Paper text:
ToxR is a transmembrane transcription factor involved in the regulation of numerous genes, not only virulence associated, and can function as an activator, co-activator and repressor. ToxS is built of a periplasmic, a transmembrane and a short cytoplasmic region. Located at the inner membrane, ToxR and ToxS react to environmental stimuli like bile acid, thereby inducing survival strategies for example bile resistance and virulence regulation.
ToxSp forms a lipocalin-like fold consisting of an eight-stranded ß-barrel stabilized by intermolecular H-bond network and flanked by two α-helices located at the openings of the barrel. ToxRp ß5 is positioned into this gap and forms main chain H-bonds with remaining ToxSp ß1 residues. The residue Arg281 located in ToxRp ß5 forms an intermolecular salt bridge with Asp142 of ToxSp α2, which restricts the opening of the barrel. When bound to ToxSp, the unstructured region of the C-terminus of ToxRp performs a disorder to order transition, by forming two additional structural elements: short α helix 2 and ß strand 5. The newly formed short α helix 2 contacts the turn between ToxSp ß1 and ß2, as well as residues Leu45ToxSp and Ile46ToxSp located at the C-terminal part of ToxSp ß1 thus increasing the interaction interface and further stabilizing the fold. L33 forms central hydrophobic interactions with apolar residues of ToxSp ß strands stabilizing the core of the barrel. The ToxRS complex exposes a bile binding pocket inside ToxS lipocalin-like barrel that is only properly built via stabilization by newly formed structural elements of ToxR.
Author numbering:
A (entry chain B): 26 to 173
B (entry chain A): 206 to 293
Amino acid sequence: DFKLEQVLTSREWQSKMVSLIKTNSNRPAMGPLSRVDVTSNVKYLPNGTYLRVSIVKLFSDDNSAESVINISEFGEWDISDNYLLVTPVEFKDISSNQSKDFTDEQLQLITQLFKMDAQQSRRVDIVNERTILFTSLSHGSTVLFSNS
Amino acid sequence: FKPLTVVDGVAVNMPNNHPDLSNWLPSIELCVKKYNEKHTGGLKPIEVIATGGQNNQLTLNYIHSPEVSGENITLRIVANPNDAIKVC
């Protein structure tokens, strides 16, 4: 049954996600946000622990990242059938802001919202020998890939 | 997975037992075609996997062949379906 465990543990896993937000007119406590790029790297250890680092870039009008958040994570993980059950233990955020578009409170909110998605359990679907898909109960998903 | 649609000869799939994504389709068709313009031949996706819908949020996961699966990416649209067409 640990087939899924052999896949997650055999490799380090990486992803990119771009979120494009034209419902920006429905939340000013996120500010002038138009786009979010997230790059992530994760290893699931056979310990039952994982570690994750994510670079979040926030965009307003500039094709320049107005703000970059580095989120580092550690926690427990477990499997039940197709479901990967995570349990974060520490979330570290370090921010950099080279812009007046985004306030401290907006970056803090966006950090809390990425913390809310990182905490969730997810169905694991094997897409190919290098690729897996993670799906949340809220039907949001992410595709992860592995180099070697 | 189960089929939703096909666009430029790329299969757009969705999970088994997934909700009705048909209310998104024009936006999916457009966001796949606008992606293919940057991703020809070996860069062209072998499939796209859609998820989401619930709570005004669509997710498209682009799957490239396993030789070059380092190009795999998730595009998430945070727009109501009427806005979503303008986002791509």
